[PDB]
């Protein structure tokens, strides 16, 4: 098939680049290491106010003050 | 509906945006969200000729 692949490359290159990049865009997301970071960045953007939640003495893992170390953090975004 | 295939398989193909209070794209309450949320709760189980 080597001749056919390069014969088309020699005569109709446009239909080989289209097929090549078509397969490249399909496969690249699976191999990239940053593919999972596309979702997290779109979870960071706070378009709506973060509604607070009452305390009943049984809500330990959520922070009290905004700038406290016991909540979700974006320190991985600053260093991406 | 005529065939409860969506319920049978459990997949909500097109039954999560039936009405206004139906989980808008971002958390933006449609106008009159509370009122129709109230109406839909009232008419549940109680069906059709008893909710009119």
């Amino acid at each position: 098939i080597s001749a056919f692949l390069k014969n088309a490359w020699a005569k109709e290159p446009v239909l080989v680049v289209s097929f090549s990049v078509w397969g490249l865009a399909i496969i690249m997301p699976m191999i990239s290491p940053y593919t999972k970071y596309a979702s997290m960045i779109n979870k960071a953007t706070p378009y709506n106010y973060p509604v607070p939640v009452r305390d009943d003495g049984n809500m330990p893992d959520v922070p009290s003050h905004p700038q406290d170390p016991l909540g979700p953090s974006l320190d991985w975004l600053k260093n991406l | 509906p005529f065939l409860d295939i969506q319920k049978k398989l459990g997949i909500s193909l097109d039954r999560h945006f039936m009405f206004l209070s139906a989980e808008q794209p971002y958390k933006n309450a449609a106008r009159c969200h509370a009122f129709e949320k109230e109406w839909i709760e009232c008419a549940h189980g109680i069906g059709g000729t008893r909710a009119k």
Partner: protein
């Protein structure tokens, strides 16, 4: 200023009425673009920007094919305009006078409800959310790719199948 959407809607009705009288398709397209162009505006007046430019970007491309097709199949030695036939012109002025008679007469019988001549412009927006982002119209259309994907496959298939449908008819 208050009577801004009403004038657009009336021009939409007049433009559509002119399209209902069915002149030669060349002018029907011109009338349709006038109505479609007005259709974009009133949609914009309601706070929606993305949908407005879509009705005016899809029907525009459609009329080129209609213009192409009409000059190929539907033509006469002397195409009919809105004034070629006095009867058509008669029902054009009558139609224009007809809406004013309907618009006015509905007002006196029913003070308000279906039509509000006395109160106009007040009843157009219904409590925008003053503070807020992601509210711009068109984000909803983008839901077609997320939690509305069924509309995406069915609509996409019609374009997919349609290509096969057209080829077979024109074979």
């Amino acid at each position: 200023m208050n009577n801004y959407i009403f004038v657009l809607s009336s021009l939409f009705l007049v433009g559509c009425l002119g399209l209902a009288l069915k002149p030669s398709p060349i002018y029907g397209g011109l009338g349709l673009i006038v109505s479609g162009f007005v259709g974009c505006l009133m949609v914009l007046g309601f706070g929606g920007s993305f949908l407005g430019l879509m009705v005016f970007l899809i029907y525009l491309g459609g009329m080129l094919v209609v213009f192409g097709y009409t000059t190929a199949m539907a033509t006469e030695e002397y195409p009919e305009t809105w004034g070629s036939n006095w009867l058509i012109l008669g029902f054009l002025v009558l139609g224009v006078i007809m809406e004013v008679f309907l618009i006015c007469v509905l007002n006196y019988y029913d003070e308000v409800g279906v039509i509000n001549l006395d109160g106009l412009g007040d009843w157009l927006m219904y409590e925008v959310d003053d503070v807020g982002v992601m509210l711009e119209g068109g984000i909803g259309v983008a839901a077609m790719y997320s939690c509305a994907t069924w509309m995406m496959v069915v609509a996409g298939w019609s374009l997919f199948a349609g290509i096969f449908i057209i080829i077979e008819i024109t074979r």
